[PDB]
Amino acid sequence: AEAKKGIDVILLYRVLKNEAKEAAWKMAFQTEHSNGKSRDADSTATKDGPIQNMAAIEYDFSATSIVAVGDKHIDELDDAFDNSELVEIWEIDKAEKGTDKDVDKYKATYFQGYVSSFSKTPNSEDALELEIEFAINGIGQKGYATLTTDQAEVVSYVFKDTVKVE
Amino acid sequence: DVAIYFEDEPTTLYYGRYQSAESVDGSSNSIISSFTIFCSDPYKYGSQIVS
């Protein structure tokens, strides 16, 4: 079988109030992100053995990227953090494709939440780095999502001849 | 009242009776707890001497 690479999972964002004007955009130069879920297990001891009682779900979310020059979406995220508005998040997997009624769609998951951290540490010898954390309401939903052509490929050059370009 | 003897004092005598216990847990078969004895005559007697 074949292992699954971690470079095939990307993230998309969109501010909630602009859901009728634009499609979700992709943040550039992503390095890693972490997604975790957990439940609190409460144990009660009886004469037969421990019995576990489970609690609600807690989400732990984080992201990391490199700030690019001329990118205006970081300003949108900063304004959303300042004014405390809702943000949508998509987690799209590029290694899975749909079969019957979703031919050009990938498996994904849908979240909404706020922004609760915004940090950056510029040093004298490295590149600028950005770290974001979220607080998520409710329970994430499952389905299939659409990726445009320019957000799913990498650009490279092709063969060229040895004559002057006209 | 009854007589109470302790092994680390082999030459003493006590007077008292059981008063109350402490709550025990019902989730185990090895239990540690305690109970209280109430002595109203507070003195510790010795052997009897006839002279």
Provide the experimental method for this PDB entry.
cryo-EM
**Whole-angstrom Cα distance, residue A57 to residue A39?**
5
Determine contact, residues A35/A28, Cβ cutoff 8 Å: no
Determine contact, residues A35/A96, Cβ cutoff 8 Å: no
Torsion-angle region of A84 (φ positive above 0: left; ψ -120 to 50: alpha; else: beta):
left
Q: Could you tell me the end-to-end alpha-carbon distance of chain B, in angstroms, rounded to an integer?
A: 28
Determine contact, residues B42/B13, Cβ cutoff 8 Å: no
Using DSSP's 3-state secondary structure scheme, residue A94 falls into strand
Q: Give the torsion through C-alpha atoms of A10, A14, A16, A20, to 10 deg.
A: -120
In chain B, what residues touch A46 (CB-CB under 8 Å)? 27
Q: Give the torsion through C-alpha atoms of A81, A142, A26, A86, to 10 deg.
A: -20
- Resolution of the determined structure in angstroms stands at 3.4
User: Mutate which of B27, B28, B30 to disrupt the A interface (most A C-beta within 10 Å)?
Assistant: B27
Beta strand segments in chain A, E:
9-15, 25-26, 30-45, 50-66, 87-97, 106-119, 129-136, 141-145
What is the edge-to-edge ordering of all strands in the sheet holding B9-21? B2-6, B9-21, B35-38
* Contact status of B29 with chain A (Cβ, < 8 Å): yes
Determine contact, residues A13/A81, Cβ cutoff 8 Å: no
* Contact status of A47 with chain B (Cβ, < 8 Å): yes
Closest alpha carbon within chain A to B28: A47
Q: What are phi and psi of A77, to 5 degrees?
A: -65, -40
Q: Do the chains contact at B29 and A47, CB–CB below 8 Å?
A: yes
Residue A49: which residues within 8 A CB-CB, separation 6 or more? Answer: none
B1 CA to chain A: closest CA distance, Å?
A: 38
Side chain identity, residue A56: A
**Whole-angstrom Cα distance, residue A30 to residue A8?**
11
User: What are the beta bridge partners of residue A141?
Assistant: A110
Determine contact, residues A25/A18, Cβ cutoff 8 Å: no
**Whole-angstrom Cα distance, residue A18 to residue A79?**
13
Both tokens assigned to B43: 């003195």
B26 CA to chain A: closest CA distance, Å?
A: 8
A42 CA to chain B: closest CA distance, Å?
A: 16
